[PDB]
Structure 1
Amino acid sequence: KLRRVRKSPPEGWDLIEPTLEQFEAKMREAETEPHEGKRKTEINWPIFRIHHQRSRYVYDMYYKKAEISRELYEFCLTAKFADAALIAKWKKQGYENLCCVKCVNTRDSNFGTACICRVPKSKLDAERVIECVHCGCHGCSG
């Protein structure tokens, strides 16, 4: 992924790189672990869950923790360590805990509705447990 950006990592990179290298180690496993004993949906869910974390790490480091500047943060987006289309949601009021992108999309559903996991999951029902088909998210609004 560093060959894709030609310029070298800016100054902060030593801090994030040990973590970012572990997310790649996870993702190579999740790409390759056997597709048997799991539902046809479940096998995809590790990909989205690791992708969500990795973007959330880069996002938390700059926005919550300020431990990377702008130039390294924007470097991470350009390298594609971070899902920056998704991060654009987390900035939004009311989406700050979002799972993937596909659950907000609406247009890919049958009835033109966002996914179920959004549904202020407090409001939804007294006891209903949920694992939405796109990414197994249990409820990402609170």
Structure 2
Amino acid sequence: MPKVKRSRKAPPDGWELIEPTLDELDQKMREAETEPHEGKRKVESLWPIFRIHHQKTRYIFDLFYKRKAISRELYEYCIKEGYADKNLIAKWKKQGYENLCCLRCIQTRDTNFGTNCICRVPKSKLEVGRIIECTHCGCRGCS
């Protein structure tokens, strides 16, 4: 019933303290995944998923880099099994990109004029206080 594991390799042994957090997070992902398509909207019914996804990888990003509270081996096992997100992480590690909402909000080809979401514009340079809801992620100004 968990993210049943493909490796068949033994998890390295920090796995036992990050186990329950990831487990309840996957509980929350399954639940917010099934949450059925109410009179909510058709653009915004996919905002939970991106939200949760960021969370999980964010969490592991902490416990390896900002706490150094897990090993390289355990962290790599946790990427390989699809808890984390290899490139969301490898993007987070850049300099202008600490809080990037979803990896698609910087895809230049997915938008006709060749730009990023207004998600990506610094809040100051707009200064108009206008609510921003990037249609992709639902984020409100990732950076």
TM surpasses 0.5: yes
Deviation at 1:2, TM superposition (A): 4.3
Q: 2:29 corresponds to which residue? A: 27
The aligned counterpart of 2:136 is 134
Query: SS at the partner of 1:14?
Result: helix
Q: Which residue identity does 1:15 align to in structure 2?
A: L
- Residue aligning to 1:68: 70
Matched residue, 2:40:
38
* Bigger helix fraction: 2
Aligned to 2:7: 5
In the aligned structure 1, how far is the partner of 2:51 from the partner of 2:30?
Answer: 13
- Deviation readout 1:46-66 (Å, 9 max, x if unpaired): 000000000000111100011
Amino acid aligned to 1:6: R
**Could you list the runs of 5+ residues in structure 2 that have no partner in the other structure?**
none
Cα offsets for 1:59-118 (capped at 9, x unmatched): 111000111111111111111110111101100000011100000111101111011101
Match of 1:87 in 2: 89
Q: Letter of the aligned partner of 1:93 in structure 2?
A: Q
Identical aligned residues as a percent: 70
The answer to whether the 8 Å contact 1:121/1:140 transfers is no
Counterparts of 2:13 and 2:41 in 1: how far apart (Å)? 43
Distance in 2, matches of 1:84 and 1:68, equals: 16
Give per-residue Cα distances to partners, 1:28-54, cap 9 Å, x unaligned: 111101101211111100000000000
Distance 2:79 2:5 in 1: 14
SS at match of 1:68: coil
Distance of 1:78 and 1:44 partners within structure 2: 24
Long gaps (5+) in structure 1 = none
CA distance in 2, matches of 1:94, 1:122: 15
- Deviation beyond 3 Å, 4+ runs, structure 1: none
Counterpart residue identity of residue 9, structure 1: P
